[PDB]
Design a protein around this ligand. Structure first.
Ligand SMILES: *[C@@H]1O[C@H](CO)[C@@H](O[C@@H]2O[C@H](CO)[C@@H](O)[C@H](O)[C@H]2NC(C)=O)[C@H](O)[C@H]1NC(C)=O
Ligand SMILES: *[C@@H]1O[C@H](CO)[C@@H](O[C@@H]2O[C@H](CO)[C@@H](O)[C@H](O)[C@H]2NC(C)=O)[C@H](O)[C@H]1NC(C)=O
Ligand SMILES: *[C@@H]1O[C@H](CO)[C@@H](O)[C@H](O)[C@H]1NC(C)=O
Ligand SMILES: *[C@@H]1O[C@H](CO)[C@@H](O)[C@H](O)[C@H]1NC(C)=O
Lengths: 24, 24
């Protein structure tokens, strides 16, 4: 719906904790 | 860098949940 939008990734601080818990 | 900074702890509302969840 927005003109001029650009593809990119947005970092999320929770996922590193999710991975850390899965490792442990 | 900052002049007059003071040592202290900053509480994180998320970590305690994973600490409680860890042992399971
Ligand atoms: C951003 O990336 C998505 C894919 O991740 C692009 O979406 C594709 O666009 C092409 C051409 O319009 C379509 O044929 C595909 O079906 C689309 N795929 C999906 C999953 O949507 C999108 O065009 C990209 N946009 C920009 C500005 O680069
Ligand atoms: C805050 O505490 C840290 C230690 O947790 C202090 O850092 C030490 O400072 C002394 C003296 O400058 C050094 O000899 C040590 O090597 C430092 N250790 C570390 C880990 O940094 C710091 O000075 C304290 N700051 C205040 C304002 O109290
Ligand atoms: C910006 O201007 C160029 C001129 O060639 C055009 O191709 C492009 O689509 C325009 N994009 C936006 C977001 O205005
Ligand atoms: C505040 O003033 C005192 C005066 O004795 C000085 O010792 C101290 O370093 C000063 N601290 C700051 C942050 O201005």
């Amino acid at each position: 719906v927005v003109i001029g939008i650009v593809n990119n990734t947005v970092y999320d601080p929770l996922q590193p904790e999710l991975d850390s818990f899965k490792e442990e």
